[PDB]
Amino acid sequence: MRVGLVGWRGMVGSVLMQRMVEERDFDLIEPVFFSTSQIGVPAPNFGKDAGMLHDAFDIESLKQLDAVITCQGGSYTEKVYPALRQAGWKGYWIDAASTLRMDKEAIITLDPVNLKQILHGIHHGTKTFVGGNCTVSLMLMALGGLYERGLVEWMSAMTYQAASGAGAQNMRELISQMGVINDAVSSELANPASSILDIDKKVAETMRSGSFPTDNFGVPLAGSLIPWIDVKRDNGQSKEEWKAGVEANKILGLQDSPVPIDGTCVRIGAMRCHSQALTIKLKQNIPLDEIEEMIATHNDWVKVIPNERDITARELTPAKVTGTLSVPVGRLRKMAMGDDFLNAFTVGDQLLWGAAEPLRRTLRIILAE
Amino acid sequence: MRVGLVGWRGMVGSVLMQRMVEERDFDLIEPVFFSTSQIGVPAPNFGKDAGMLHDAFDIESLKQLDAVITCQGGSYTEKVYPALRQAGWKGYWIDAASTLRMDKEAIITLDPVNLKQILHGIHHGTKTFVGGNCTVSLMLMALGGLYERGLVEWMSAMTYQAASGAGAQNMRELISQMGVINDAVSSELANPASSILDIDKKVAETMRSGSFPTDNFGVPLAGSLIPWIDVKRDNGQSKEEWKAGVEANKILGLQDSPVPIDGTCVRIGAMRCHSQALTIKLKQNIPLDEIEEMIATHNDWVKVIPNERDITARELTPAKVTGTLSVPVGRLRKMAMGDDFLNAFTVGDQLLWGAAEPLRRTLRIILAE
Numbered sequence A, B: 001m002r003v004g005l006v007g008w009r010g011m012v013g014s015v016l017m018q019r020m021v022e023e024r025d026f027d028l029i030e031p032v033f034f035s036t037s038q039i040g041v042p043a044p045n046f047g048k049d050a051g052m053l054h055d056a057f058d059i060e061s062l063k064q065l066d067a068v069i070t071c072q073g074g075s076y077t078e079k080v081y082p083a084l085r086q087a088g089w090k091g092y093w094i095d096a097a098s099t100l101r102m103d104k105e106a107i108i109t110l111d112p113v114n115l116k117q118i119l120h121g122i123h124h125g126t127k128t129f130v131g132g133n134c135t136v137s138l139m140l141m142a143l144g145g146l147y148e149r150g151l152v153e154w155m156s157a158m159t160y161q162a163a164s165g166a167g168a169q170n171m172r173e174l175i176s177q178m179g180v181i182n183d184a185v186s187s188e189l190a191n192p193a194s195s196i197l198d199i200d201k202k203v204a205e206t207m208r209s210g211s212f213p214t215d216n217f218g219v220p221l222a223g224s225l226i227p228w229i230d231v232k233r234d235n236g237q238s239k240e241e242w243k244a245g246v247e248a249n250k251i252l253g254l255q256d257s258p259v260p261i262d263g264t265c266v267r268i269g270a271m272r273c274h275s276q277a278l279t280i281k282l283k284q285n286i287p288l289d290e291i292e293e294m295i296a297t298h299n300d301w302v303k304v305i306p307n308e309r310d311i312t313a314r315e316l317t318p319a320k321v322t323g324t325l326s327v328p329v330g331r332l333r334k335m336a337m338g339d340d341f342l343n344a345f346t347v348g349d350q351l352l353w354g355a356a357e358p359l360r361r362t363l364r365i366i367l368a369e
Ligand SMILES: NC(=O)c1ccc[n+]([C@@H]2O[C@H](COP(=O)([O-])OP(=O)(O)OC[C@H]3O[C@@H](n4cnc5c(N)ncnc54)[C@H](OP(=O)(O)O)[C@@H]3O)[C@@H](O)[C@H]2O)c1
Pocket: A006, A007, A008, A009, A010, A011, A012, A013, A034, A035, A036, A037, A038, A056, A071, A072, A073, A074, A075, A164, A165, A166, A167, A168, A355, B193
């Protein structure tokens, strides 16, 4: 199988490359590396020589491939994909970008949840497989055990989203903001006789100053939060909030009778883990023991954390989860509203299950068929 | 009126002192400053001379006061209050601590919401007035318009709570953690060609290192979050999550038919403003514009922020609200679940309406009678 790699060099792509090396995916394919910036020089060597960098925009070159895996982004997909299909290419397009997710000829891939849908697609001529939004993938990796059994009536999701979803420059800006805050009060911070109100005043002033580094976010993130991600939609949702409902229901095959999913998506000062606080309305009063079992046994990465303070503080956080494939879920309990209302809190790495991991797993599934 | 000040030197106390000076509250009283560790030292001079610091545990000196305002804490209240009352003191005990909130003898003071309850109490011999929990006070300042009309069937609250709620040392530790994070990668950040994954790897290593300053939180807060605040209760709630339902319903006089309030309380890396993402179940499908009107007309400090991207990012954040008495609420819209589900996101300063302001306002109400 001859597989083209586009966007292998960037943040998401680099995570994907490391995972492909770790799982020895390159043993199974003939990789062809593409560039949007410079061609003809040696391709990267991740264990074996792959020749040269090819032109990511050349239709005839792409037509020679059995599949493309792209992390290059929506601008790239919009430019290349329609022409490539119009020219007769029947290969597999495996894409991280949002561009094609809701296309009638694309399947959103999250195989621990929807392997059966993926396999049906592959066997019946579907050639486009798109990774879902970070928030969607991470929520379903935590709650797949409930959703697969049709037990969810609706879900409200309030999120705590990392800088990495906006990009590497945004992550850098977050850390720079942290430095500028600390710099402003370093002379008084450690002195207990210094007024905490004076420290606080200076932090607030520094954050509000024009020179505070805010080119990417537009406003401060460190020391604060931003309760709006992406463009407004006419019903008053942000695009980020809208994605949850439409993508989750496509993945689950419920488009004609969807589970309502809604809430507020909030950016917070974390590097690359998204967390979500969920009000889950169950159709029936399911005992918490069964809920816990159904969640825990759904897949190999979800981890149900006991509902206790110390273990929660250690396990159910970005500090614990960052850079790992683990998807902890905790604070699982029935709520004051009734025994059909379930509280849950979950954390997951945005670059792994939220970006790169579904792409490499989709490749392995296609290979095995 | 002779008024004793206890806990005036701490964080909450210092905010109270600042506000009392700003509003010239000291012109209306005879202030007597007390201490737990500095007896005999000259008292602070806020305009006029108040002599020396008195003994906060000496019952007989406290007995000469017409009122006590205390920000010293629950363990202080636990020892001095019962002893002071039993010795026949009938003065006004005005307290920020949780200890007496749910005592039959005490009124929870949040006068923009429950002034009538407060005055009825004053007129019928109630002498104990206690500030509510920071999250409860801030939520009712935002949504008082809906609660006072009996429109809320239930509410789920997922919170984004600031460091100040845990204490001054915790705020310092947050800022220290921010510096330690930036320090670890400041060279790489200054080089525009550096690898984002390398920066990310170093940040994670730094946050996980034994040397990371985590004595007060127990785990990292900068770059992370902690989805547990305060001690565990038997039904799986933390004490922080439980406080909302019991305190709000007492403030609203709804103990005979309380509104269910529940959710997850999460500490994030903000300095001194709590934010809350609310799923509000309404009893009736009221038009959105009338909802906004009910909310906005309830009190002088609540503000409706239009549901638009740029203004939300600028106005509905800790960076905007910090150190002010403003209580913005935005992202007001009906949710996917139905037109009787209302999304709301609100931000408020933890030290003002969430701690010090109800104390000085209660003093002013008593004086005014
Ligand atoms: N999940 C997310 O993080 C997210 C969110 C929203 C949008 N996006 C979109 O998806 C795309 C991929 O996300 P990303 O975070 O992986 O983007 P990224 O790190 O900026 O990488 C994107 C591309 O930039 C090019 N590039 C230019 N200079 C580079 C340098 N010095 N180092 C590495 N690459 C360089 C590379 O393509 P060549 O090798 O062809 O030059 C690379 O594949 C983004 O460009 C963006 O449009 C991603």
